[PDB]
């Protein structure tokens, strides 16, 4: 029925979405912009925004939870140092979805997900 | 009398000092205002047109905005009708709150049920599932036979098959009203009313009982 049920499935395993979103989150905390389809972009926003919110206060325990999920010292290094103090005053959404054309191979409605860090 | 238009706002329990719990549904009935009255002199029947709620200044369209302008009332989120009981004519612009149910003991509720999509035959019509073993290949929850043979030669008009379940207007009647929270603009009914928590309800006094 799906009534009030959230979280997209993306035709994949629960063990696949766990690791796909783990790596796709790590690419955005390594390049700040990535191109992907909408149903992945609408979901990447759901796992990075709570990740940045977690990285808002530096701690020993927070950097464990930041490493438990996302399993990367480097992404954790870019957080708490770069992306931690950068979005300290912005309260809420730390990313932005920008739609674009379609994939020529399979007609997927692509979109640009990016951190709000274009202006330097 | 006629009935009011409210909005289903969840359900709770109301404890009696005897000790019996009462499953009570809270019905938010705001100030129902009357936009138009109808008489046999122009409409052939005797009924009123109510409205409740508050739309936005950009959403109430021009044909709608002129309709609320003739009464001189605010623009609600919908319009409904209520057939009059021969001696209860109201005026255009009159606001009925909840007080008509100050003496009513049993009400009937009317609202659109929850939508369930394209439901199966065992779910929509309570057909029994076949044996899911012993030999049953590829047919566990199917309907099985749907008609006889050459003599009828066709499926009869009105066969219970798979289709759209729910998302239709139903009327669960003879519900006892528990407490008329007049100053909070509520209505407490014993039981369960159709509709999701937020979909409107046409509550009206019991015609059957």
């Amino acid at each position: 029925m799906r009534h009030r049920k959230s979280g997209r499935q993306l035709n994949r395993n629960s063990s696949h979405r766990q690791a796909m979103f783990r790596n796709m989150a790590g690419s955005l905390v390594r390049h700040e912009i990535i191109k992907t389809t909408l149903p992945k972009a609408k979901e990447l926003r759901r796992v990075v925004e709570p990740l940045i919110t977690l990285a808002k206060t530096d701690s020993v325990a927070n950097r464990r939870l930041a490493f438990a999920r996302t399993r990367d010292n480097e992404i954790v290094a870019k957080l708490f140092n770069e992306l931690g103090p950068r979005f300290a005053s912005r309260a809420g959404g730390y990313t932005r979805i920008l739609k674009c054309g379609f994939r020529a191979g399979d007609n997927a409605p692509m979109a640009y997900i990016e951190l709000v860090d274009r202006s330097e | 009398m006629i009935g009011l238009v409210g909005k289903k706002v969840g359900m709770t329990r109301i404890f009696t000092e005897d000790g019996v719990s009462i499953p009570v549904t809270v019905i938010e009935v705001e100030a129902n205002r009357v936009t138009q009255v109808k008489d046999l002199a122009n409409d052939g029947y005797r009924a009123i047109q109510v409205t409740t709620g508050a739309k936005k200044a950009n959403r109430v369209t021009k044909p709608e905005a002129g309709h609320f302008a003739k009464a001189g009332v605010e623009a609600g989120r919908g319009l409904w009708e209520f057939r009059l009981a021969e001696g209860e004519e109201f005026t255009v612009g009159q606001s009925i709150s909840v007080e008509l149910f100050a003496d009513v003991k049993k009400v009937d509720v009317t609202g659109t049920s929850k939508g369930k999509g394209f439901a199966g035959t065992v779910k929509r019509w309570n057909f029994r599932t076949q044996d899911a073993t012993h030999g049953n290949s590829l047919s566990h929850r199917v309907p099985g036979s749907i008609g006889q043979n050459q003599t009828p030669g066709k499926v009869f008009k009105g066969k219970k098959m798979a289709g759209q379940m729910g998302n239709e207007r139903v009327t669960v009647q003879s519900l006892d009203v528990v407490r008329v929270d007049a100053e909070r603009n509520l209505l407490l009914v014993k039981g369960a009313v159709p509709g999701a928590t937020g979909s409107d309800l046409i509550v009206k006094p019991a015609v059957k009982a």
Partner: protein, 122 residues
């Protein structure tokens, strides 16, 4: 939810140790039996010197269910183990003398005062 083929326990000194409900009495096509509903049982296990033996088709009345009984506030009372008290078909009186294993207050219906008088608790 006591129904046909349900293996019960005996809650009094009548002679049986384990009985099996063969048909839930009452209404036609009745599926499950409840709190103090009458059922027809058969005796599957017995003591040697009892008033009854294996294979007696006598009635009973449920007393303790593993499903429970819901008091009118929603407070269910959930026993652990199905049990019953044997009856005397034509006259419906309890054939057992001392009923052990606490009963529920829903039995107080003018036909089971003899059971709620001989019960230890509740």
């Amino acid at each position: 939810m006591i129904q046909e083929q349900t293996m019960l326990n005996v809650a009094d000194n009548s002679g049986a140790r384990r009985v099996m409900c063969i048909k839930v009495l009452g209404g036609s096509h009745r599926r499950y039996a409840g709190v103090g509903d009458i059922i027809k049982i058969t005796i599957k296990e017995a003591i040697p010197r009892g008033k009854v033996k294996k294979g007696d088709v006598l009635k009973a009345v449920v007393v303790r269910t593993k499903k429970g009984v819901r008091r009118p506030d929603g407070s269910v009372i959930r026993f652990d183990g199905n049990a019953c008290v044997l009856l005397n078909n034509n006259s419906e009186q309890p054939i057992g003398t001392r009923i052990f294993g606490p009963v529920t207050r829903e039995l107080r219906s003018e036909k089971f005062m003899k059971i709620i008088s001989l019960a230890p608790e509740v």
